[PDB]
Amino acid sequence: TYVSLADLERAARDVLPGEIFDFLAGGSGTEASLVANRTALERVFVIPRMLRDLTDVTTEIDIFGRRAALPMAVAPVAYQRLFHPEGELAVARAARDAGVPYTICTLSSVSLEEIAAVGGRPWFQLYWLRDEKRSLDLVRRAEDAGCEAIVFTVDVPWMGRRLRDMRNGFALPEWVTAANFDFAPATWESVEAVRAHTDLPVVLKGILAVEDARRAVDAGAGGIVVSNHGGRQLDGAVPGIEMLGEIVAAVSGGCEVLVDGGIRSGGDVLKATALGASAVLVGRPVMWALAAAGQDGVRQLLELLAEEVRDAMGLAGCESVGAARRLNTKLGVV
Amino acid sequence: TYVSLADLERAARDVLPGEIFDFLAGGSGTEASLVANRTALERVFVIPRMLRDLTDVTTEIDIFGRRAALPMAVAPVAYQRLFHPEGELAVARAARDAGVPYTICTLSSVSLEEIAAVGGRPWFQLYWLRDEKRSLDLVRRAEDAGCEAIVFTVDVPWMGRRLRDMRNGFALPEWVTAANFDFAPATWESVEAVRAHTDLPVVLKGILAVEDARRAVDAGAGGIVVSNHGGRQLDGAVPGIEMLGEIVAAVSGGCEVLVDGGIRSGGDVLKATALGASAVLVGRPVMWALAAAGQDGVRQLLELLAEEVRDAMGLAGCESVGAARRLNTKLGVV
Amino acid sequence: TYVSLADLERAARDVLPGEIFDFLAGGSGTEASLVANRTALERVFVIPRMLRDLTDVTTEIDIFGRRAALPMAVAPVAYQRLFHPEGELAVARAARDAGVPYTICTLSSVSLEEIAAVGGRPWFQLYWLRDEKRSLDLVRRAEDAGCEAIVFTVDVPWMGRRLRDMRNGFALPEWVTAANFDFAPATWESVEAVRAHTDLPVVLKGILAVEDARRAVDAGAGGIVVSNHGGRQLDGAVPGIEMLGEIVAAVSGGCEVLVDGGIRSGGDVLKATALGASAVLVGRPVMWALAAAGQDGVRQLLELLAEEVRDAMGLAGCESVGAARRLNTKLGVV
Amino acid sequence: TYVSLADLERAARDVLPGEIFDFLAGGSGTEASLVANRTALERVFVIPRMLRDLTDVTTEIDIFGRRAALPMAVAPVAYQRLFHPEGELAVARAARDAGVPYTICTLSSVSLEEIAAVGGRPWFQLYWLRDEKRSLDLVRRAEDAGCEAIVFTVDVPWMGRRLRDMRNGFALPEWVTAANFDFAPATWESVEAVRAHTDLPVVLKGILAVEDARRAVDAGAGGIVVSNHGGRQLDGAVPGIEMLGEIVAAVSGGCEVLVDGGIRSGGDVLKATALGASAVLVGRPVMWALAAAGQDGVRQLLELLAEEVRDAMGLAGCESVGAARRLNTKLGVV
């Protein structure tokens, strides 16, 4: 019995070792961006529509050539065995069963081929490596294994300053490894090398500047994720949700525009959609569910989110995600 | 001795069982909209006028063909026997004696005919039923019983997610029933079916989008209530008070424009009026009064509100509600 | 040793009976306007000027034909014997010695003639009485006694709802009386009756609407006080400080424009001046000083305020009050 | 092991006597400006750029004819022997070793010649003295000793009202003296006297009004520091960070534009740069480090700041400080 995503955070805090909970929860620096991701969503209010036909409400979208059950995917989160022994396999199985895309990480603690074998038409998140040819090898592995999109993370020339991790002296346990292995700053040249190497849609994750969104389209990206990396990279980076509307207007249908950071309910999904998002990513809550109850926990989380999305959409007069994108919003004060 | 509406909430909390107080107080989801209803009112400041003739201050209005003693009606609140054994009869009697319209609910715990027999020229709130012909039967019953307006609630295709009720496992006590009985999403077609079935003014309750207000006028509505259902429906819905001015301008006298959500004083009534409302509805405070002291409690609440409205109007230089509608406002910070 | 006005509030709270402290401190309703008076000042920041000649900084102004030592007068506060046995005489003596105008109240607890005999070129605050001819008698008494301005309070058609006083059951002690005696709502006609009866400047206290300020000038007022009566009248009335700039622009030198509400330091005086005020009134702090230490307390308060005003002006590059009125401001967040 | 500047404040509070910590931490009046310096920075969010070449990130700038390792100098802070026995020598040595300019104060507790002999191409802060000829003597001493800029503080016609110091009865210990000695308000004439006396760039510290910035350029200043003196002068003065963008636009490259007040991280440096600053000054944190651990403490602070600046710049896609100045920002809510 979980009735909100916050029930799951409480459950995860109970079971996880403190330093692992901190690795999960924390952000960089003073955690200004981490907090602002929540602030920004809480300031948005939706102007719902009434009296529309709701006889066949559907939360489905088409994205990167696949139907998804919700306008949502599981965000790339490294090292999922930190949270539960089944790690990425548990999460991927639940995502598959829920009809939600799952993003396999470069720093997965189970190999990408094993996770892809779970099924459910998975995405692959890329960190740019030592070498162009090595980078392109992970991309080719992902494609050969049936991944359907390459989510190239562009906001990590290096890892942010995670003061909780520094203070805890946090290190990976011996029993958690980067299973895809036996990194350098990405540039626009790296993006082109990836685009030239694969037929899969390339999705640039970590875009916040409007001109970078425009350039992403010009560069041949199939999508972007408007994101400050959950407040874990530049401390003081604007929340993605605050740039989303401007970015959606600037790209003017040229690529899919996803957003992440602080999505904690179906109502938040509705807000993101109303601001123009094609879909959202959800990170920490999926890990809370994994920590609390493994695969079944993630299943329950996704069922709860699905119900909340359906509920919010219908209450707002939206029989489809497209209708939700046409909702207006108004900023309030919290 | 109650000197503010907050005195009544304190009294009601003392006497009501926790789960019933929660059914009354709560909202949907995170209660963002519930809180925002209060935030929005607290941000509004009035610019009073001075030195005007106040030799005959009157708080009366004409609405739907009846004089009312205040620019206020009792909001539809389901299942009033939850709060006091006399339930709707106690509230309706006090409203009648105060010259305030009372809204009889589809989900009243005393039959609509019994409540109408109390007198006081009552309104009837409609939820759209299984069937057009059944829906229209409640409407015809209401009209035959002397109800003077049909308040069609348009923001409940289904009930919101009330997490307090879920956590409490709340259910109606055996001794409380829907006394009008021995529901489907409404659409604009439903509104037309109702309008075609009755000579009474049809008032659409739960409008927040400006274009829905315009469409309400085009559809032949006699009024609208600009409302987020007390924060009980879409969590994240904008407060009605924040949409009110824009809606008043858009309908440009084409129907009565009421507002509700968070009205807790005569000063709040003045604010609503200054933002352009024809009248307000008041929900929870009426139930606090009912719980605290039955009919006499509701009488005392309405007397207090009447005094506060008169006081606020005169201090603001308004001898009539029309003058109060011409007051200007200015947003502050709280 | 008082180094801020807040030192005096602490001292007054220690010595005064609770219900008298509440009569002094309180506002109407929820005290929204009382709090907002402070909020509004705290949001204002000054843009100081540097490198200007400060060899003869003067805080003096000319107002209503008299030099004053500061851009400040003691606000009308009824019944000063509530706070100290010497009441109005103690305050008036200290104001005289400091070169600050003192406003004698219609509801003074010492007769206006006695207070005027203290000297210091006093003002007289008028509440409109039962009768035009009686009202005009107080005005004539004030003028005969040497009062130099009539401060006609225009925001009290009746007293606001003071919930602290209601809850305390507050009443005047037997030993405090309205010493000018052995009231009706004012209108613009009342203002004209007063203007026709006296050669003294008539100052309308309690103006908040821009058009009322304009009408005050048209009506022959020599000044206005932009004021919400210290949050004691309409609860939800905008702070005077928020209307001041707009009012100053609208009257365009046609009368003196004073402001009051929440002035608690020389820096606040500077802010008021920079927003365009001719001068401020100070109410509660003067009573704190009276309660704490009688005449000497008020002297110390006025010395402290004088020092703070001089300090703030010079730090802001202003050798005169006129220069301070030409300072720019910028709203911040607190 | 310090991982943030806040670690150093905690360490300094532990070791310093309360009244000395208060002399350091405090501001004038109600400390409104002190707090606002932090508020203003916390409201700014950066819009980072992605995918840019970061193969040679450099935090260096050229200013007043010298390379500096960071866009930062140590602010003038009087009487550094209050914080550690080595006082200014410890701080100057660490600044030299870090490649950061150090501002020698008129009220240094070690003579300016001794501090200059440490090396590191130092600046000299001037307070205007009794006499033009005396003022010019300090300037000539500074120049003869190898100081490279004259930082003329223009916001201290006299010292602000420091209520912590008043309440503590704070006075310099016998063992701390103004070592440059065995003051009057500055004006634009004083600035010209200094400019005519030295070939060194004259930098006016404490400018907040846009027209004063313009006049500084017209007066021949080589730079300005946009500053409210750390909230220690006019209480209610706008934060420098809030005026910075407007000032940068108005001077349009005519002089260097520095800012100070509340810089507490490399991210704050990035924000200042993105708002257009040439460089920042840092005051209190340098003293925290000095108090906590002397020269080595200051070294550690500067190393930490250097790392944070590099980190923030790279995460924001900036290979140089010039690129950081071209970043856009967006205000949020905290």
Ligand SMILES: Cc1cc2nc3c(=O)[nH]c(=O)nc-3n(C[C@H](O)[C@H](O)[C@H](O)COP(=O)(O)O)c2cc1C
């Ligand atoms: C513990 C953790 C690890 C993460 N690892 C990665 C990663 O390897 N690659 C990546 O692109 N993003 C990574 N992210 C960022 C997420 O993809 C996502 O941007 C962020 O979690 C969204 O915010 P939310 O957690 O508030 O939902 C990680 C986030 C967390 C919390």
Ligand SMILES: Cc1cc2nc3c(=O)[nH]c(=O)nc-3n(C[C@H](O)[C@H](O)[C@H](O)COP(=O)(O)O)c2cc1C
């Ligand atoms: C316990 C409760 C039951 C309600 N039942 C109904 C209902 O049956 N029909 C309806 O249109 N609104 C219903 N409402 C909403 C109210 O009519 C009204 O919109 C809301 O109470 C106004 O906000 P307030 O309670 O802040 O005054 C209910 C509200 C509450 C608190």
Ligand SMILES: Cc1cc2nc3c(=O)[nH]c(=O)nc-3n(C[C@H](O)[C@H](O)[C@H](O)COP(=O)(O)O)c2cc1C
């Ligand atoms: C205890 C008390 C009594 C007052 N009596 C009067 C009055 O008789 N006439 C009047 O015009 N204003 C009266 N005022 C209002 C003050 O003149 C003034 O508007 C208010 O005190 C200014 O705000 P401040 O107290 O924040 O300085 C009174 C205020 C207080 C606190």
Ligand SMILES: Cc1cc2nc3c(=O)[nH]c(=O)nc-3n(C[C@H](O)[C@H](O)[C@H](O)COP(=O)(O)O)c2cc1C
């Ligand atoms: C204890 C202390 C002493 C100071 N002494 C001087 C001074 O002698 N001259 C001067 O121009 N500024 C002086 N300042 C102001 C600083 O140069 C600088 O403007 C301020 O410290 C910047 O804010 P920060 O402390 O928040 O970094 C002093 C500041 C402090 C805290």
Ligand SMILES: O=C(O)[C@@H](O)c1ccccc1
């Ligand atoms: O945010 C995170 O922790 C991941 O994105 C991450 C980034 C770099 C190295 C390891 C893990």
Ligand SMILES: O=C(O)[C@@H](O)c1ccccc1
């Ligand atoms: O300023 C705006 O309106 C947007 O940038 C915005 C701000 C906060 C939340 C969502 C969107």
Ligand SMILES: O=C(O)[C@@H](O)c1ccccc1
């Ligand atoms: O808000 C409420 O509780 C009522 O509007 C309500 C709505 C639907 C079913 C029962 C009661």
Ligand SMILES: O=C(O)[C@@H](O)c1ccccc1
């Ligand atoms: O933005 C506005 O001014 C209005 O939408 C509004 C906002 C808050 C309260 C009342 C009205």
Ligand SMILES: O=C(O)[C@@H](O)c1ccccc1
């Ligand atoms: O604010 C106050 O208390 C006075 O203005 C006042 C007004 C009316 C009657 C008595 C006293």
Ligand SMILES: O=C(O)[C@@H](O)c1ccccc1
């Ligand atoms: O909105 C504005 O700028 C003014 O009304 C104002 C608001 C708050 C304080 C002073 C002045």
Ligand SMILES: O=C(O)[C@@H](O)c1ccccc1
């Ligand atoms: O802010 C401070 O304390 C210094 O700027 C200062 C100013 C004037 C005298 C002594 C010290």
Ligand SMILES: O=C(O)[C@@H](O)c1ccccc1
């Ligand atoms: O109003 C603005 O945008 C600027 O004055 C400003 C305000 C707050 C922080 C930095 C900059």
